[PDB]
Amino acid sequence: QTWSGPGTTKRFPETVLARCVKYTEIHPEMRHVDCQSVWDAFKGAFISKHPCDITEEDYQPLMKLGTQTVPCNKILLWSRIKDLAHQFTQVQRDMFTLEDTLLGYLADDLTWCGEFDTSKINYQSCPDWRKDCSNNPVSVFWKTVSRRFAEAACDVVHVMLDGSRSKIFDKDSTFGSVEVHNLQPEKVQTLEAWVIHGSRDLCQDPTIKELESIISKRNIQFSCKNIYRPDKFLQCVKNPEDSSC
Ligand SMILES: Nc1nc2c(=O)n3cnc2n1[C@@H]1O[C@H](COP(=O)(O)OP(=O)(O)OC[C@H]2O[C@@H]3[C@H](O)[C@@H]2O)[C@@H](O)[C@H]1O
């Protein structure tokens, strides 16, 4: 193929449009959104543009339309453990991840790119962030929304981390390279990490100490908890202290 990454997801346009409709139906705060407009702004960011030359400015019309307030003190970040984060917030909406927002919901699990000097979508391949370029439509989208999500957070912010990874905290992740550096010291009191086990006290892991030290220097308190049994954890969230939770 031209590029090394997978092509635009089959039915991408129909899918984004349908997700926008469904989202705006469910969430009253976004009932004002015109979904065709959202789609046109989304398209505008990457159609007829070189897919290794995308900027955050390309996504500004979309950011504008998807403008949204979520409770700033109930934010859940995560790294390498998306599924658990999603299952947790779905129980009773204790917290909100980026996918609980319109823009995050539209884009989750999709890939897309265009081509320079033709107005079509590329269903054959899209740039891989490593081999091709990092300035590609998908990578640039997530960097942009994740920066914005972190900037809006306040009070106690939580992050779920995968304890089974080689680096439980990875400075190379979007959490580690973007979100950590965009939490606002004026607003964020504490970052609390939940390290999910797959054992030891993983909160004393070296990369966790690194995370602690980094956020301390931004003037933010750090807290850490082991979640030894994600299965029991979810059961306790669903059945709160009904049992021995
Ligand atoms: N679908 C999706 N939602 C995402 C999200 O909300 N965030 C980042 N990436 C996201 N993705 C895609 O999922 C893959 C894999 O992401 P990883 O497991 O390595 O974790 P990370 O890099 O630390 O990003 C998570 C972090 O940033 C925000 C979010 O708020 C969260 O706090 C990304 O490349 C992206 O294409």
Q: Give the CATH number, domain containing residue 172.
A: 3.40.50.720
One domain, residues 210 and 119: no
Q: Whose CA is nearest to atom 16 of ligand 1?
A: 80
Q: How far apart are CA 29 and CA 158, in angstroms?
A: 24
One domain, residues 131 and 174: no
- Closest to 114 in 3D by CA, of 166, 44, 16: 44
What are 51's two structure tokens?
């897919």
User: C-alpha distances in angstroms, 87 versus 82, 99, 157?
Assistant: 9, 12, 18
Cα atoms found within 13 Å of the Cα of residue 140, Cβ hemisphere only: 24
Q: Which atom of ligand 1 is nearest to the CA of 159?
A: 32
- Closest to 8 in 3D by CA, of 179, 141, 100: 141
One domain, residues 118 and 80: no
One domain, residues 128 and 243: no
Q: How far apart are CA 207 and CA 197, in angstroms?
A: 15
Q: Which residues line ligand 1 (CB under 6 A)?
A: 77-80, 82, 97-98, 104, 108-109, 142, 146, 149, 173-175, 179
State the distance from the centre of ligand 1 to the C-alpha of 104, rounded, in angstroms: 10
- Closest to 18 in 3D by CA, of 28, 26, 7, 6: 26
**How large is the greatest C-alpha to C-alpha distance in the chain, in angstroms?**
62
Question: How far is C-alpha 26 from the geometric centre of its chain's CA atoms?
Answer: 20
Q: How far apart are CA 143 and CA 115, in angstroms?
A: 21
Question: What's the resolution in A?
Answer: 1.9
Q: Whose CA is nearest to atom 15 of ligand 1?
A: 80
Q: Output the DSSP codes for 164-221.
A: TSSSSS-TTSHIIIIITTTS-TTTEEEEEEEEEP----GGGSHHHHHHHHHHHTTT-E
Euclidean distance between the first and the last CA atom of the chain, given in angstroms as a whole number: 52
Instruction: Tell the residue number behind the tokens 């202290």, with chain if given.
Output: 241
State the distance from the centre of ligand 1 to the C-alpha of 228, rounded, in angstroms: 23
**Which sequence positions are flagged as catalytic?**
72, 154
Q: What are phi and psi of 76, to 5 degrees?
A: -115, 115
The structure's method of determination equals X-ray
β-pair type (114-115, 118-121): antiparallel
The count of structural domains within the chain is 2
Last residue of a domain, one of 152, 171, 196: 152
Q: How far apart are CA 141 and CA 145, in angstroms?
A: 6
The 10 Å CB-count burial string (b at 16+, else e) for 10-43 is eebeeebbebbeebbeebeebeebebeebbebbb
225, 192 in Cβ contact below 8 A? yes
Query: Domain limits at 45?
Result: 1-69+97-152
One domain, residues 17 and 124: yes
Q: How far apart are CA 39 and CA 17, in angstroms?
A: 6
